[PDB]
Amino acid sequence: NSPRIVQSNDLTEAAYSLSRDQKRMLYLFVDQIRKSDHDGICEIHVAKYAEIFGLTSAEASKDIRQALKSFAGKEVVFYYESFPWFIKPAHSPSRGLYSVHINPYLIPFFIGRFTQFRLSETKEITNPYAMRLYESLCQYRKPDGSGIVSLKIDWIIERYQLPQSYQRMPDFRRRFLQVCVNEINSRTPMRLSYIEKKKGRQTTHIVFSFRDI
DNA sequence: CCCGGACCTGTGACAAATTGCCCTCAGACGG
DNA sequence: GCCGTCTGAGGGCAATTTGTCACAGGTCCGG
Ligand SMILES: [Mg+2]
Ligand SMILES: [Mg+2]
Ligand SMILES: [Mg+2]
Ligand SMILES: [Mg+2]
Ligand SMILES: [Mg+2]
Ligand SMILES: [Mg+2]
Ligand SMILES: [Mg+2]
Ligand SMILES: [Mg+2]
């Protein structure tokens, strides 16, 4: 059925800041690259993007165009080593068609210890931080569909590049943790719960348990 | 001892960002 | 060779969500 995304854990655990629209495009690049027999040159069709994510052609065009120009200057850190995503601006040879030049030094980090999920699992998620959380949980999923993992809060803040006010724990709870656990439970086939680990007055880890519906 | 102080929690406000919608009009193609 | 239609590249919108901070209200420490 739907496209099966796979990626090296090094990408799941990398430090970067991307929007929802950019992350959506990134899944197709990883799919194109992996399906190959490099050049790092990928392509996106407006009308295909619209059908995949149930958008109109117009709003697809707006999403691709603005996503594409917001990649400029974005950088990726693997814990460390920093790379730019793109080494040339995007451009459109034909109407409804975009051509992009991914940094060929990124290829081995995409294909290597791996993470996998079908694209239908994530295509209704809205908050990009919630996409990051669902990817990290998939990294620990078992064949049958369950798993349990303890993630450190400081590592969450670094890897997902959360904004500065979420270093105050009550804001972390209200605007990130609760919201992203609610989307996953509402928008994916996963059912997720958690509990907090403490040391003194400080909360240090979050312990996630999940099963499949 | 009661205090001021250094931690922690959650909630009420407001500011800045993102969402799916809507409308226009020229490009690429076929009847 | 023109034209009606299917696209998609632009300009926008109000309704929600996300990002930030002041203040109320708990504990323990040391003086
Ligand atoms: Mg958009
Ligand atoms: Mg402490
Ligand atoms: Mg006593
Ligand atoms: Mg008093
Ligand atoms: Mg706008
Ligand atoms: Mg009261
Ligand atoms: Mg007080
Ligand atoms: Mg309290």
Side-chain angles (χ1 to χ4, degrees), chain A residues 1-3 5-87 89-213:
Chain A
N1 193 242
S2 166
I5 306 306
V6 306
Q7 65 180 53
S8 165
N9 288 356
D10 300 323
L11 182 66
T12 303
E13 309 185 331
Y16 64 83
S17 177
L18 295 179
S19 81
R20 183 205 59 180
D21 294 352
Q22 290 169 320
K23 272 192 80 60
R24 276 172 171 183
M25 289 174 66
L26 173 53
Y27 290 149
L28 317 168
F29 299 146
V30 166
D31 198 13
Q32 173 149 29
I33 281 168
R34 181 194 168 59
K35 294 193 61 93
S36 289
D37 287 344
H38 299 291
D39 43 18
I41 306 189
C42 309
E43 311 184 1
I44 288 179
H45 292 64
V46 180
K48 186 52 165 163
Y49 187 106
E51 203 191 316
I52 287 182
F53 301 108
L55 295 170
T56 64
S57 179
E59 183 73 28
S61 171
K62 198 202 293 295
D63 291 343
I64 290 91
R65 291 184 282 111
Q66 292 180 351
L68 278 182
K69 284 270 264 163
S70 291
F71 267 99
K74 296 291 183 73
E75 80 194 22
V76 172
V77 186
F78 306 89
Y79 276 98
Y80 71 83
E81 281 189 305
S82 172
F83 305 85
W85 296 97
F86 294 6
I87 76 169
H91 82 79
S92 165
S94 306
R95 183 171 169 85
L97 182 64
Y98 293 81
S99 176
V100 65
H101 303 155
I102 302 277
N103 196 333
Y105 284 141
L106 285 186
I107 303 297
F109 294 87
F110 290 10
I111 300 319
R113 314 290 290 290
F114 69 109
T115 305
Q116 79 170 111
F117 50 91
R118 273 198 154 171
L119 169 77
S120 53
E121 280 166 80
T122 63
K123 57 191 197 172
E124 300 198 68
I125 310 183
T126 311
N127 189 313
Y129 301 139
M131 309 170 75
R132 303 281 338 250
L133 179 56
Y134 184 102
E135 277 168 47
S136 287
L137 295 163
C138 278
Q139 187 192 341
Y140 297 91
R141 188 166 49 186
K142 298 307 192 210
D144 58 70
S146 57
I148 179 170
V149 67
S150 160
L151 295 173
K152 221 196 161 178
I153 291 173
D154 294 341
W155 177 102
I156 286 178
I157 286 165
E158 169 180 62
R159 253 53 164 184
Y160 305 177
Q161 288 186 346
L162 297 191
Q164 70 80 17
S165 76
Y166 297 165
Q167 283 177 344
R168 209 183 67 99
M169 208 52 82
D171 294 326
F172 178 93
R173 283 180 192 105
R174 184 161 75 155
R175 292 286 197 259
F176 155 69
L177 183 57
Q178 283 157 26
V179 303
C180 294
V181 161
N182 293 345
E183 283 206 1
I184 290 170
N185 276 320
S186 304
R187 297 255 165 87
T188 74
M190 179 153 80
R191 248 54 154 180
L192 179 65
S193 85
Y194 70 84
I195 59 174
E196 298 189 13
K197 177 157 155 192
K198 313 177 46 163
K199 164 174 269 199
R201 287 187 190 179
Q202 281 72 45
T203 292
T204 70
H205 304 52
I206 305 281
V207 174
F208 295 101
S209 308
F210 59 89
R211 64 194 180 63
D212 186 294
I213 208 67

PDB file of all heavy atoms in Angstrom, chain A residues 20-21 59 62-63, chain B residues 19-20, ligand 1:
ATOM      1  N   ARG A  20       6.596  21.717   9.445  1.00  0.00           N
ATOM      2  CA  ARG A  20       5.813  20.573   8.980  1.00  0.00           C
ATOM      3  C   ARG A  20       5.972  20.369   7.479  1.00  0.00           C
ATOM      4  O   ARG A  20       6.272  19.261   7.018  1.00  0.00           O
ATOM      5  CB  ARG A  20       4.335  20.745   9.326  1.00  0.00           C
ATOM      6  CG  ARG A  20       3.507  19.530   8.914  1.00  0.00           C
ATOM      7  CD  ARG A  20       2.040  19.847   8.678  1.00  0.00           C
ATOM      8  NE  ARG A  20       1.850  20.846   7.634  1.00  0.00           N
ATOM      9  CZ  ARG A  20       0.666  21.300   7.244  1.00  0.00           C
ATOM     10  NH1 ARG A  20      -0.458  20.850   7.779  1.00  0.00           N
ATOM     11  NH2 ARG A  20       0.608  22.222   6.287  1.00  0.00           N
ATOM     12  N   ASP A  21       5.746  21.431   6.699  1.00  0.00           N
ATOM     13  CA  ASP A  21       5.826  21.324   5.248  1.00  0.00           C
ATOM     14  C   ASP A  21       7.204  20.857   4.802  1.00  0.00           C
ATOM     15  O   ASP A  21       7.327  20.051   3.873  1.00  0.00           O
ATOM     16  CB  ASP A  21       5.447  22.654   4.597  1.00  0.00           C
ATOM     17  CG  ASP A  21       3.987  23.016   4.814  1.00  0.00           C
ATOM     18  OD1 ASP A  21       3.233  22.162   5.330  1.00  0.00           O
ATOM     19  OD2 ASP A  21       3.588  24.145   4.457  1.00  0.00           O
ATOM     20  N   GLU A  59      -2.782  25.384  -2.937  1.00  0.00           N
ATOM     21  CA  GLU A  59      -2.158  25.377  -1.617  1.00  0.00           C
ATOM     22  C   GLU A  59      -0.921  24.491  -1.591  1.00  0.00           C
ATOM     23  O   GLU A  59       0.030  24.778  -0.852  1.00  0.00           O
ATOM     24  CB  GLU A  59      -3.157  24.930  -0.549  1.00  0.00           C
ATOM     25  CG  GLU A  59      -2.598  24.960   0.875  1.00  0.00           C
ATOM     26  CD  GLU A  59      -2.439  26.363   1.436  1.00  0.00           C
ATOM     27  OE1 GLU A  59      -3.200  27.269   1.029  1.00  0.00           O
ATOM     28  OE2 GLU A  59      -1.544  26.556   2.289  1.00  0.00           O
ATOM     29  N   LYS A  62       1.749  26.790  -2.881  1.00  0.00           N
ATOM     30  CA  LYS A  62       2.200  27.683  -1.816  1.00  0.00           C
ATOM     31  C   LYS A  62       3.090  26.955  -0.813  1.00  0.00           C
ATOM     32  O   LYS A  62       4.108  27.502  -0.370  1.00  0.00           O
ATOM     33  CB  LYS A  62       1.009  28.332  -1.112  1.00  0.00           C
ATOM     34  CG  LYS A  62       1.406  29.566  -0.309  1.00  0.00           C
ATOM     35  CD  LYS A  62       0.407  29.890   0.785  1.00  0.00           C
ATOM     36  CE  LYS A  62      -0.925  30.316   0.198  1.00  0.00           C
ATOM     37  NZ  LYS A  62      -0.794  31.593  -0.560  1.00  0.00           N
ATOM     38  N   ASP A  63       2.727  25.723  -0.437  1.00  0.00           N
ATOM     39  CA  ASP A  63       3.511  25.014   0.572  1.00  0.00           C
ATOM     40  C   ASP A  63       4.901  24.668   0.048  1.00  0.00           C
ATOM     41  O   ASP A  63       5.904  24.936   0.720  1.00  0.00           O
ATOM     42  CB  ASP A  63       2.772  23.755   1.030  1.00  0.00           C
ATOM     43  CG  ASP A  63       1.528  24.072   1.841  1.00  0.00           C
ATOM     44  OD1 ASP A  63       1.408  25.218   2.319  1.00  0.00           O
ATOM     45  OD2 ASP A  63       0.671  23.178   2.010  1.00  0.00           O
TER      46      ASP A  63
ATOM     47  P    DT B  19       1.318  25.467   8.831  1.00  0.00           P
ATOM     48  OP1  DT B  19       1.971  24.139   8.786  1.00  0.00           O
ATOM     49  OP2  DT B  19       1.605  26.444   7.758  1.00  0.00           O
ATOM     50  O5'  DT B  19      -0.263  25.233   8.895  1.00  0.00           O
ATOM     51  C5'  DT B  19      -0.871  24.733  10.074  1.00  0.00           C
ATOM     52  C4'  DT B  19      -2.370  24.981  10.051  1.00  0.00           C
ATOM     53  O4'  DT B  19      -2.630  26.351  10.422  1.00  0.00           O
ATOM     54  C3'  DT B  19      -3.025  24.791   8.690  1.00  0.00           C
ATOM     55  O3'  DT B  19      -3.493  23.441   8.556  1.00  0.00           O
ATOM     56  C2'  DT B  19      -4.191  25.787   8.702  1.00  0.00           C
ATOM     57  C1'  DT B  19      -3.769  26.836   9.738  1.00  0.00           C
ATOM     58  N1   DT B  19      -3.462  28.189   9.166  1.00  0.00           N
ATOM     59  C2   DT B  19      -4.360  29.212   9.360  1.00  0.00           C
ATOM     60  O2   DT B  19      -5.404  29.076   9.970  1.00  0.00           O
ATOM     61  N3   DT B  19      -3.993  30.411   8.810  1.00  0.00           N
ATOM     62  C4   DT B  19      -2.839  30.686   8.101  1.00  0.00           C
ATOM     63  O4   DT B  19      -2.599  31.800   7.644  1.00  0.00           O
ATOM     64  C5   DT B  19      -1.938  29.571   7.931  1.00  0.00           C
ATOM     65  C7   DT B  19      -0.656  29.751   7.173  1.00  0.00           C
ATOM     66  C6   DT B  19      -2.288  28.388   8.467  1.00  0.00           C
ATOM     67  P    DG B  20      -3.645  22.765   7.103  1.00  0.00           P
ATOM     68  OP1  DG B  20      -3.705  21.301   7.306  1.00  0.00           O
ATOM     69  OP2  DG B  20      -2.595  23.344   6.233  1.00  0.00           O
ATOM     70  O5'  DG B  20      -5.076  23.270   6.576  1.00  0.00           O
ATOM     71  C5'  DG B  20      -6.284  22.776   7.174  1.00  0.00           C
ATOM     72  C4'  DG B  20      -7.473  23.651   6.795  1.00  0.00           C
ATOM     73  O4'  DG B  20      -7.115  25.050   6.929  1.00  0.00           O
ATOM     74  C3'  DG B  20      -8.005  23.489   5.368  1.00  0.00           C
ATOM     75  O3'  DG B  20      -9.442  23.676   5.362  1.00  0.00           O
ATOM     76  C2'  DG B  20      -7.285  24.607   4.623  1.00  0.00           C
ATOM     77  C1'  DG B  20      -7.254  25.703   5.686  1.00  0.00           C
ATOM     78  N9   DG B  20      -6.164  26.659   5.523  1.00  0.00           N
ATOM     79  C8   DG B  20      -4.846  26.379   5.252  1.00  0.00           C
ATOM     80  N7   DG B  20      -4.098  27.445   5.161  1.00  0.00           N
ATOM     81  C5   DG B  20      -4.975  28.498   5.396  1.00  0.00           C
ATOM     82  C6   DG B  20      -4.740  29.894   5.428  1.00  0.00           C
ATOM     83  O6   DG B  20      -3.674  30.497   5.247  1.00  0.00           O
ATOM     84  N1   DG B  20      -5.906  30.607   5.701  1.00  0.00           N
ATOM     85  C2   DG B  20      -7.140  30.043   5.916  1.00  0.00           C
ATOM     86  N2   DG B  20      -8.146  30.893   6.164  1.00  0.00           N
ATOM     87  N3   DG B  20      -7.374  28.738   5.888  1.00  0.00           N
ATOM     88  C4   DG B  20      -6.249  28.029   5.624  1.00  0.00           C
TER      89       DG B  20
HETATM   90 MG    MG D   1       0.377  26.583   3.832  1.00  0.00          MG
END
